[PDB]
Subunit: 115 residues, 4 copies
């Protein structure tokens, strides 16, 4: 599993459950081509987005649909989504975890990159 | 000054100086149209981006050129840039500060929305 | 003004107003001695805590009374308070801003150390 | 495992390995009594600090020795440590994960509290 996303809720002190995540890859014409999508589980994790064969070098965008998450809890948040844009696999295959912590008017994101 | 950006460096504990910031507005066709841009000052702030008359309700994207900032420091960064996408509304408190705290593999951002 | 504190609310997107902040200095016996205190202003800032003559090198603790802030908003918080413990040195850039961003179950803090 | 600590490094994009963690519990005289301690593993996690029987109600302080971590990597950081102080188990036993993200001049911490 070369690309995983884990999301926490800073208001309730819990995993962020059932947040939609869309991954895009920049094409030659510089548009964002849809690459993979899914929803976080009860543990706040999203596994199984892609495979090592499919996850080639490129510039990827991970979009976390935070507005839908807050609106479904009856909260009006500030951001449309949380986005993370990065070059991947440019020195060979790596494994990426995108971690995020969400508040209605704020988010933090970090990356854990292994072997 | 309805929209301001402030950027901090979590590695050096300093304002983020001379970093390019681009603001875009989402058009009817759903593309991002350039709206305003600048470079942060010695205090890490970018003022005077827009005016009240120009800053109408809609969806805006603030892009911070973090990759060039880290590279100028000889530091290898993770992100291509930091992006903040939000709706401006008139029922809200008028003045928007977008704040960001930068590390090579992480960033945090918050909005401070205040005042009459 | 060698030491300043600024506090932001990540739930409401606003400065954290009227929150108690206590500063302590570590004594020779290793206890924490009261040093300075105040409440944040309408802009979430606390200025005038100390002076250059009083703010000597040593270990300091800044305690932000976050629990009372959230309770006043009717919100159940996790932390008893937020604490920031650091050494002040004279080889460093003189002015210290302690910044904190608050959520009910989380806080982030950074230091901005600048200027002659 | 009712109390766990997980720490990430925002500079290197990796788990924070071998950071010391000390837990204290406030005594009746309001002093901080040592309660448990350990070091994070290669995954950045610290398990096995306490048991459900020992982890009674009280005010606990989790101190993450971030200065020793940065100094061992040849970096001079700002903070002495990162501290998290909270009341635990006041509505019955819960499981607590204290998560932290570290930079030389900054840290963030969040809590995940379950059942
Ligand atoms: O004038 C402001 O808004 C300042 C400020 C800017 C940013 C923050 C800040 C603090 C913590 C985080 Cl995680 C983030 Cl994203 C931003 C902060 F606490 C203060 C003090 C410089
Ligand atoms: O298994 C993980 O990776 C977990 C985790 C997820 C997120 C973080 C985290 C903690 C703080 C910040 Cl600011 C950010 Cl962006 C992420 C954290 F410290 C830990 C513990 C749930």
């Amino acid at each position: 599993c070369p690309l995983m996303v884990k999301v926490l809720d800073a208001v309730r002190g819990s995993p962020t459950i059932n947040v939609a995540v869309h991954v895009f890859r920049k094409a030659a014409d510089d548009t964002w081509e849809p690459f993979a999508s899914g929803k976080t589980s009860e543990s706040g994790e999203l596994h199984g987005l892609t495979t090592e064969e499919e996850f080639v070098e490129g510039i990827y965008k991970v979009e976390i649909d935070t507005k839908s998450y807050w609106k479904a809890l009856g909260i009006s948040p500030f951001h449309e989504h949380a986005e993370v844009v990065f070059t991947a696999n440019d020195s060979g295959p790596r494994r990426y975890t995108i971690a995020a912590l969400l508040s209605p008017y704020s988010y933090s994101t970090t990356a854990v990159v292994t072997n």
